[PDB]
Design a protein around this ligand. Structure first.
Ligand SMILES: Nc1ncnc2c1ncn2[C@@H]1O[C@H](COP(=O)(O)OP(=O)(O)O)[C@@H](O)[C@H]1O
Ligand SMILES: [Ca+2]
Ligand SMILES: [Ca+2]
Lengths: 138, 1044, 137
């Protein structure tokens, strides 16, 4: 499972990526500051935008193959998020769940550290709070 | 040449008469109160017409007659109002206008009310460093507006309160629902919130800078727009900062405390209240694409123009604390908030009242001899049939709309035909307005000029919109080449008097790209829709070589066609290769547009029965249709008869499959062996198809490759190796990756040299370039060869003796076939067209192989990439339009090249489940989807890596030094680190032709136009390029190639 | 994003901290005279890139079946061999190793913030490199 697509979007979010990493690098999720939450939100939304663009605009060498599989996984998640096939953007292995995976991987490949399930949980909990009124109607 | 006896009669009035007399008195002699008669040159006459057009007003009416003898006279042209004259010489239904006017004015009064926040006022005088607001100002406006209306309120409730100017003192902004709150309040468009009329005003307020655009895209929600619209749709994706309070402050309060603003709002509220039935029309208005987008047009343009005007002390309370904008030149805060709201409202009414006058006031083309002149030449006989057919249905098209299909074969004379069809549908008394939109990414000056030449028009009648496509309105480097009436423009006040937009709309005939009009429906932000929307509303539309589009661009084209229908335009598609599922989808897009068009404008209730028409080189016919089923049936019938006639035309082409042998397959190695084989094939084709004169033989060949990178490599390889023994090869490299003026100059040479006819050997060899090339060399055999990208398939009137073609699609193959013996009758019968059995992608082992360009997808795969399987062997012997114009049945989308095209088209055009997007294209007209940017986002036009625009710029200081530069935002940066020159190798007996020395042509361009050498490069020397980190290699002969 | 710069985009995505520092520090800057904080931000990011790109060439981190990616790889290879003293010994020559690294830094800047930097800023990055990477300690 390649990460070419993920990398192109991260390489276009360096400011928001560094900001998230520095702000969280040694943090503990059970005691997060306003600014830590917001550092996570700002990165996830930046990734959201780039990846959504990637799927909608079909930015992918369909001839590649390992890349095309990666692309189809994102497409699947998008169509399960935006209402076109389903409406569960915060479901396990869906859109935001995959966005959090990209965020933990980016920290790892930058500063060596390994976040796990506890960080992922708090990210998902932030993404539901900050981003639920993007999909729903009150 | 000869002097003609010329008569001029003037029906001019007012200041126009004064201006006419002041011109005509100079160049002709007065022989009556309103008549001149004088002997004159054709040149002097063309010059006289131009001058007359240039200062013409709406009251100008001059007729020109050629007196050819005592008995005979001929009408040459008319300038201005062609009524005032009979067949030669001297003798509204806007049902929603008031509703629209009132909505627009009310919205205008509330549009920037949100600018009254701490944050926006702060931002006004901030000075620096800048950074954005948080919430967008139009969003807070909407919610301010909602707070005044109050939730669950009636339309009468809020209007009666607003009409009462005794009110009141801000108690209602307690009820303000704030989106800075942790936990959100229900969005302003839910059912227990704003009432219908308020929602229309609401929509107009919130959408004045950008279309709302959300992350939920389910079809059900689209059906319910604007209900779903919440804060995240409206630029408040800008999160956060934590004020979040500064956007919701207001100290001082609001425009409600300005007595002038408060008074004008009461008058508008009062007007709405006394307008019979308007409150009840409320919900029908909100879901009407015509009413909403026309209102948005008026709002945005009034806002655009008033924003540019200086502060007005006579407007609004002089004391008013809040400002709306600052100075652009200076940095000082100037133009109060109430002032601006009132200024925009004023100009909305003024602009609203102007719209119904556009038909009577915009320049038109009348009594053009070129479109009325009968055709003596058989081969263009069909043009006359097509003209009569369109004349015969003019009356019905005027009342019912028009959807026409010019399916004439490649090479038949479609341009003139197209001009004559639309012209026939115009009011004979007032004349025509139409636009020719070509299906290319970029329109060169030369291709624009070819339209002029073919339609017999000059730059006083036909405007060229030059270039490609990305508050200044309509791009920035986009230049409209036009020399006619600009002066007394009906919309000159809001548009510039000399701006691109004004020129674009003033021109009787417009030549541009489909990309240039696309923003009409496609644009998501700014006033990019304004200029082309106006064009659509005031002119008819030719969509030229429309199906050259990538399949993924077709949903946007449908949106555009639907909008042509929706705004009263009449549409003619011109392409030999239009497939059933495409015309079917476009018809439905047009039909559903015209239906809404008919609720406002024309006699009420009249049925939707579109005037459809088919034209080709054999015949033309029209009939009315109000269902897609009967249209489909008439179309299938007309095609079926056309097939019979085609199936029995004498062949002029004969295709043969050439197997390619590879090696690496590393690109350079592959191109070397491919060039190696091409040397043999070219020799074979030259031996069979050539012209002999005085012991020498010349032939012209076309090499078509799909992509520019492999094309450039192949050019290098072909230059490296020589010509084969005994042969002289002249190579011309032609693609889209040249500077725009270079490409224009290549086309100029190719267009001129590739004009052929029967028994023309003597004239051919006499042409200087070829005369020269033959006097210069010993060889008796010359091959003139164009290596071209797919940019040679469309808009080139070229006659090649032969061609070697890399396969991409069936349309491509058909288009290229028609460039072979295009002008010449007969045919030896030997093969003159060679098709590589495989394409570059396939020979490099890429799968899908038929894409970028092409139709093949992992979801729609082919089981063999070899043409030996992908075509019917029966096709090779007679290449014409047949395989594109009818679907085969059954379809083999996996085994056949063309069947794939059809399957892909039928899966997309009208289906409820189009591949990828999964949202039906018809949701554009079956829902209020257009209140959002959901479909433009989810089915994006020109999807892909973005092209950024570059040029070889003469230095700001020194004219003789060049810098490779990138266009940024109103300025060009030096990017010399991203350009590497490239030296070339030549083989024996080879040279280039149809080439262009950049500097020599740049200097020449900057003569014809009286420009600075630098400003000429910025305007005409652009090249569009996908951003690449390490830059490009450049050679003047080859253009730009990606550098690794 | 395209289908053209996958080798450098992978490395950039592993240099976020250093990439952010260069960009932020150099926002609203002046190329012909620069703060010591700046010259340091431009140096650290160029070293992070050198480390990542060298490793890609040496450890052969490329799918040789991609053609497009392999052509980008080959150009980096041709540059390193002209830098490490195997084919040649000219790392500061035009179109060479550091030349290409500055181009990455510029493209990275253009793609995150949309600055206008070109030839002028490039030559100032090359001056720095020639100074601070004069000899490999
Ligand atoms: N009356 C005419 N006589 C000769 N050529 C014409 C005439 N009118 C237009 N042309 C040029 O030749 C073309 C006619 O053939 P056409 O079917 O358009 O070729 P294609 O389908 O390849 O664009 C026109 O589109 C135009 O470029
Ligand atoms: Ca505004
Ligand atoms: Ca405004």
């Amino acid at each position: 499972m390649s990460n070419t697509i993920s990398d192109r979007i991260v390489a276009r979010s360096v400011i928001e990526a560094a900001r998230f990493i520095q702000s969280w690098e040694d943090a503990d999720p059970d005691s997060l500051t306003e600014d830590q939450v917001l550092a996570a939100a700002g990165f996830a939304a930046r990734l959201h935008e780039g990846l959504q663009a990637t799927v909608l605009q079909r930015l992918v060498d369909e001839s590649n193959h390992e890349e095309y599989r990666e692309f189809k996984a994102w497409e699947e998640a998008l169509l399960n998020a935006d209402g076109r096939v389903a409406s569960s953007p915060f479901a396990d292995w869906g859109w935001w769940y995959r966005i959090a995976n990209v965020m933990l991987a980016t920290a790892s490949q930058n500063v060596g550290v390994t976040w796990g399930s506890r960080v992922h949980g708090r990210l998902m909990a932030i993404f539901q709070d900050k981003f639920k009124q993007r999909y729903e109607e009150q | 040449s000869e002097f003609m006896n010329i008569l001029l009669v003037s029906q001019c009035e007012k200041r126009a008469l004064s201006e006419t007399r002041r011109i005509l008195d100079q160049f002709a002699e007065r022989r009556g109160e309103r008549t001149w008669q004088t002997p004159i040159t054709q040149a002097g006459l063309d010059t006289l017409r131009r001058l007359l057009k240039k200062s013409a007003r709406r009251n100008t009416a001059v007729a020109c007659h050629w007196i050819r003898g005592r008995d005979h006279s001929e009408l040459l042209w008319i300038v201005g109002d062609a009524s005032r004259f009979n067949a030669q010489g001297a003798v509204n239904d806007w049902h929603s206008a008031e509703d629209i006017r009132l909505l627009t004015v009310m919205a205008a009064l509330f549009h920037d009310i949100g600018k009254a926040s701490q944050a926006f006022q702060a931002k006004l005088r901030n000075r620096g460093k800048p950074m954005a607001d948080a919430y967008r100002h139009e969003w807070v406006s909407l919610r301010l507006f909602e707070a005044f209306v109050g939730p669950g309120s009636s339309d009468e409730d809020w209007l009666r309160r607003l009409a009462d100017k005794r009110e009141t003192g801000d108690a209602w902004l307690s009820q303000l629902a704030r989106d800075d709150r942790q936990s959100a309040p229900p969005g302003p468009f839910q059912k227990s919130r704003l009432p219908p009329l308020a929602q229309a005003v609401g929509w107009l307020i919130v959408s004045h800078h950008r279309l709302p655009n959300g992350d939920h895209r389910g079809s059900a929600s689209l059906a319910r727009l604007p209900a779903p619209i919440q804060s995240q749709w409206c630029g408040a994706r800008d999160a956060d900062a934590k004020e979040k309070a500064a956007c919701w402050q207001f100290p001082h309060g609001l425009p409600f405390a300005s007595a002038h603003w408060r008074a004008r709002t009461a008058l508008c509220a009062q007007s709405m209240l006394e307008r019979p039935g308007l409150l009840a029309r409320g919900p029908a208005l909100l879901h009407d694409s015509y009413v909403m987008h026309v209102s948005r047009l008026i709002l945005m343009l009034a806002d655009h123009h008033y924003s540019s005007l200086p502060a007005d002390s006579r407007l609004g309370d002089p004391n008013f604390p809040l400002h709306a904008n600052t100075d652009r030149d200076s940095g000082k805060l100037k133009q109060r908030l109430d002032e601006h709201l009132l200024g925009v409202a004023l100009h909305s009414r003024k602009l609203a009242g102007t719209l119904p006058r556009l038909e009577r006031q915009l320049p038109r083309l009348a009594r053009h001899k070129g479109f009325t002149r009968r055709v003596e030449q058989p081969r263009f006989r069909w043009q006359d049939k097509a003209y009569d057919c369109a004349m015969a249905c003019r009356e019905q098209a005027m009342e019912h709309g028009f959807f026409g299909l010019n399916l004439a074969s490649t090479g038949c004379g479609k341009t003139l035909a197209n001009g004559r069809i639309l012209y026939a549908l115009a009011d004979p008394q007032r004349g025509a307005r139409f636009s020719i939109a070509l299906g290319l990414r970029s329109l060169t000056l030369q291709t624009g000029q070819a339209y002029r030449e073919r339609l017999g028009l000059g730059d006083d009648d036909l405007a060229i919109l030059v270039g490609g496509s990305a508050q200044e309105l309509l791009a920035e480097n986009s230049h409209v080449h036009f020399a006619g009436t600009l002066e007394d423009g009906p919309l000159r006040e809001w548009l510039g008097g000399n701006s691109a937009g004004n020129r674009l709309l003033q021109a009787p005939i417009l030549a541009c790209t489909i990309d240039h009009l696309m923003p009409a429906s496609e644009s998501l932000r700014g006033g990019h829709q304004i200029a082309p929307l106006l064009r659509l509303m005031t002119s008819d539309l030719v969509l030229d070589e429309v199906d050259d589009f990538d399949i993924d661009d077709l949903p946007a084209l449908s949106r555009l066609v639907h909008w042509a229908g929706l705004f009263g335009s009449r549409v003619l598609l011109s392409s030999a290769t239009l497939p059933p599922a495409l015309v079917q989808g476009l018809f439905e897009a047009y039909r559903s547009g015209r239906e809404i068009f008919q609720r406002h404008r024309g006699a009420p209730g009249r049925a939707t029965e579109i005037r459809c028409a088919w034209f080709d080189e054999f015949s033309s016919q029209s009939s009315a249709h109000g269902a897609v089923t009967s249209f489909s049936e008439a179309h299938a019938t007309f095609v079926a008869q056309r097939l019979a006639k085609l199936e029995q035309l004498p062949p002029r082409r004969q295709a043969q499959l050439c197997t390619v042998h590879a090696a690496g397959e590393a690109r350079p190695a592959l191109c070397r062996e491919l060039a190696g084989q091409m040397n043999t094939w070219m020799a074979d084709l030259h031996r069979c198809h050539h012209t002999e004169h005085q012991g020498r033989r010349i032939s012209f060949g076309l090499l078509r490759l799909a992509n520019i990178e492999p094309l450039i490599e192949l050019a290098q390889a072909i230059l490296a190796q020589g010509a084969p023994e005994g042969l002289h090869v002249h190579l011309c490299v032609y693609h889209s990756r040249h500077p725009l003026l270079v490409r224009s100059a290549i086309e100029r040479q190719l267009d001129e040299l590739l004009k052929r006819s029967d028994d023309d050997a003597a004239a051919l060899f006499a042409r200087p370039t070829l005369a020269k090339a033959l006097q210069a060399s010993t060889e008796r055999d010359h091959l003139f060869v164009v290596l071209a990208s797919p940019v040679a398939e469309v808009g080139r009137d070229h006659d090649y003796d032969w061609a070697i073609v890399e396969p991409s699609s069936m349309r491509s193959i058909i288009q290229l076939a028609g460039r072979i013996r295009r002008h010449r009758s007969g045919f030896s019968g030997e093969a003159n067209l060679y098709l590589l059995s495989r394409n570059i992608r396939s020979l490099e082992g890429q799968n899908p192989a038929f894409q970028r360009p092409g139709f093949e997808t992992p979801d729609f795969p082919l089981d063999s990439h070899d043409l030996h399987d992908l075509l019917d062997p029966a096709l090779l012997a007679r290449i014409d339009a047949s395989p594109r114009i009818v679907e085969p049945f059954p379809l083999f989308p996996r085994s056949r090249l063309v069947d794939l095209e059809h399957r892909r088209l039928r899966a997309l055009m009208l289906a409820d489940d189009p591949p990828s997007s999964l949202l039906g294209v018809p949701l554009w007209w079956q829902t209020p989807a257009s209140l959002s940017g959901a479909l433009q986002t989810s089915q994006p036009f020109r999807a892909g890596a973005k092209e950024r625009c570059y040029a070889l710029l003469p230095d700001e200081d020194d004219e003789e030094r060049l810098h490779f530069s990138r266009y940024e935002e109103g300025t060009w940066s030096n990017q010399d680190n991203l350009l590497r020159n490239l030296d070339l190798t030549y083989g024996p007996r080879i040279q280039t032709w149809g080439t262009v020395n950049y500097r020599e042509e740049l200097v020449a361009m900057a003569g014809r136009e009286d420009l600075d050498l630098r400003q000429c490069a910025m305007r005409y020397g652009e090249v569009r390029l996908r951003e690449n980190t390490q830059g490009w290699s450049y050679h003047p002969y080859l253009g730009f190639k990606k550098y690794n």
